Design a protein around this ligand. Structure first.
Ligand code: NCD
Ligand code: NCD
Ligand code: ZN
Ligand code: ZN
Ligand code: ZN
Ligand code: ZN
Ligand code: ZN
Ligand code: ZN
Ligand code: ZN
Ligand code: ZN
Lengths: 364, 364
């Protein structure tokens, strides 16, 4: 007996095209998405070239339209030079991404004044998301209040961060957040097994107490999002390992295992992988789109999942219960039992759909 | 023709007693204060032992009462263990100091939740000051808003920081700040002369653009305070130089030079070294207390000032115009032309004066 889910949405993926296509490209990354029960992804802008201007966005749009197998929206990235220049293309993007700490990213800003300039100039009705760790969460929340708008915090990983967000929500502040599966299912306890290179990720893996705090504060978590951050094994195991884990193919199986164990409900999962992503990012429905999962199937995560070019996974050896059996995307069979059945280019930019534009008031 | 000033107040000094008395002690540091035209100082808690509990405060009070030559108040320091424990002694302190970044300090906190706990537990009517650099300024402002109270930002040193505070004030937020003389009168341009050890200070010396921004935004600066941070030349020039500059003896001459050049007015100076310190920290008046200065005397800062045990100065070689000629403290001549004339122990804890208690509403 399969369970039918709606088309799940991952609002934080790195698909590496343009410029990093040995790690992943639109075709491989969206195959990984479909195999993970994900029918829509929002791709981050830290590519090469980074998506920080209109010409780079135009290129990325075409590469995505040609390569994507599932539907998508593309983020713009904030830079030290582009505040006040993105107005004509802003509405065509998923939102604006701010990189406020050291990580795999033309995009760390050097001053909080630059953050303020982005919050002041980016259209007020469009999403802003931030990589903001530890005190940076409080800092960016202050900037959002000064500029009287909302902000979404990416990959929350620590007790400190979730409790700060909880306190902000208790004061009625417009903040939402997401959590990635590695911060729910891995911790410091796993670093011995992973080793120092594979274990590199930002935010770093947390203590058992961090992980426990995220679970205890599930009510504070608006979305799950993979932060699918593919790098090859050679890169992860080499002399300057880049941070990040692949995660599209493992996210849903990990979370279904948790549902089966009663750690959260099916509804809790679907709020966080479907309804809240839609409402925070104003992402449109996908007609005749659904995912069929088998909740009874027990399996062990192998040393690499079939689709991501990363060709490794930090979840190797974990026992999971739950598998994606079939995905239908806009009336076509997209995935069955390990086979992707839609070609590169089947996917579409949801921001071009009439229903995918973010509503806004008319010029004065 | 001498100009009579009121008794000036320095709300940020490190007097090193207990535990660092080769660098300074209450007697030498307050001699330095008097020679700099300062009749009241607020001493920071990063001593050895640090002033983070009632017994340490009791010790420091007695050492100060016995050694101080000018009047004083003593800060308590926030630690990772003392939130909720300082209520009985809080009103006897200058205020609570939070160390939120790496510097010469049992006192960096590890989580913003610890900051929140201090803001929630410290009595709401008493001062809180923070060492908070760059984005940390925005973060601590967020914590202050979440807990609906004020905060004072120590030694603002950067364009980024003063502009953030300016934006907060424009939104009516209860934030005040101070600036130290080295951030007004030294910059990166001076690092070649100072060298890497002597030049170590937190916040670090800024660019010419940082310095220019502080001057341009003088209206945003509530107080001047030295951050007198004495260390010996051996320590500054050794293999692990501690950050900090001595500054009590040079602050007023530097600022008087600026007044003489029309960079700020005498009133601007007195707001920042007298009236605003009084009102932010609820420091009492000092009866029959004044400072006589000679505004015409030109001199060059020597390699060390006479009183601080630091026995060096980063302002060596700067030409100044303005000198402290006489200080009268509570009806006694305390300083004349290079001679301190009040003994260790003349100074008093202003928080013990009836007029030095911070006003508060009665228990419910
Ligand atoms: N999270 C990571 O460790 N890496 C991400 C970047 C990011 O989300 O910050 C990547 O693009 O590789
Ligand atoms: N400012 C410094 O560089 N050092 C100060 C500490 C401080 O004010 O942070 C000290 O106590 O030495
Ligand atoms: Zn990130
Ligand atoms: Zn994100
Ligand atoms: Zn990311
Ligand atoms: Zn909507
Ligand atoms: Zn400091
Ligand atoms: Zn201070
Ligand atoms: Zn200090
Ligand atoms: Zn008062």
């Amino acid at each position: 007996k399969l369970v039918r889910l709606p088309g799940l949405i991952d609002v934080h993926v790195h698909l590496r095209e343009p410029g990093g296509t040995h790690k992943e490209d639109f075709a491989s990354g969206t195959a990984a998405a479909l195999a993970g029960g994900i029918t829509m992804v929002c791709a981050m802008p830290n590519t090469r070239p980074p998506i920080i201007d209109a010409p780079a966005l135009a290129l990325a749009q075409k590469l995505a339209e040609a390569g994507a197998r599932c539907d998508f929206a593309l983020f713009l990235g904030a830079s030290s030079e582009n505040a006040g220049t993105l107005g004509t293309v802003a509405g065509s993007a998923a939102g604006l991404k701010l990189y406020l700490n050291e990580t795999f990213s033309e995009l760390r800003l050097d001053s909080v004044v630059q953050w303020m300039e982005h919050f002041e100039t980016w259209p007020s009705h469009l999403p802003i998301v931030a990589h903001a760790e530890q005190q940076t969460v409080a800092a960016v929340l202050m900037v959002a209040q000064l500029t009287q708008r909302s902000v979404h915090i990416c990959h929350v990983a620590r007790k400190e961060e979730i409790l700060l967000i909880k306190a902000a929500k208790a004061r009625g502040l417009p903040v939402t957040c997401e959590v990635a599966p590695h911060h729910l299912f891995l911790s410091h306890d796993d670093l011995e097994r992973l080793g120092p290179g594979k274990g590199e990720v930002r935010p770093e893996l947390g203590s058992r107490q961090d992980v426990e705090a995220l679970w205890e504060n599930m009510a504070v978590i608006d979305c799950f999002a993979s932060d699918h951050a593919p790098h090859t094994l050679e890169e992860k195991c080499g002399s300057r390992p880049p941070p990040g884990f692949p995660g599209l193919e493992t996210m849903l199986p990990l979370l279904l295992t948790a549902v089966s164990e009663g750690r959260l409900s099916l509804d809790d999962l679907l709020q966080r992988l479907h309804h809240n992503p839609r409402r925070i990012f104003h992402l449109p429905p996908q007609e005749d789109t659904y995912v069929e999962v088998d909740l009874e199937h027990e399996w062990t995560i192998p040393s690499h999942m079939p689709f991501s070019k990363a060709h490794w996974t930090p979840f190797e050896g974990q026992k999971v219960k739950g598998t994606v059996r079939r995905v239908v995307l806009r009336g076509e069979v997209a995935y069955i039992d390990g086979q992707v059945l839609v070609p590169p280019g089947y996917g579409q930019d949801v921001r071009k759909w009439p229903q995918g534009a973010v509503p806004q008031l008319p010029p004065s």
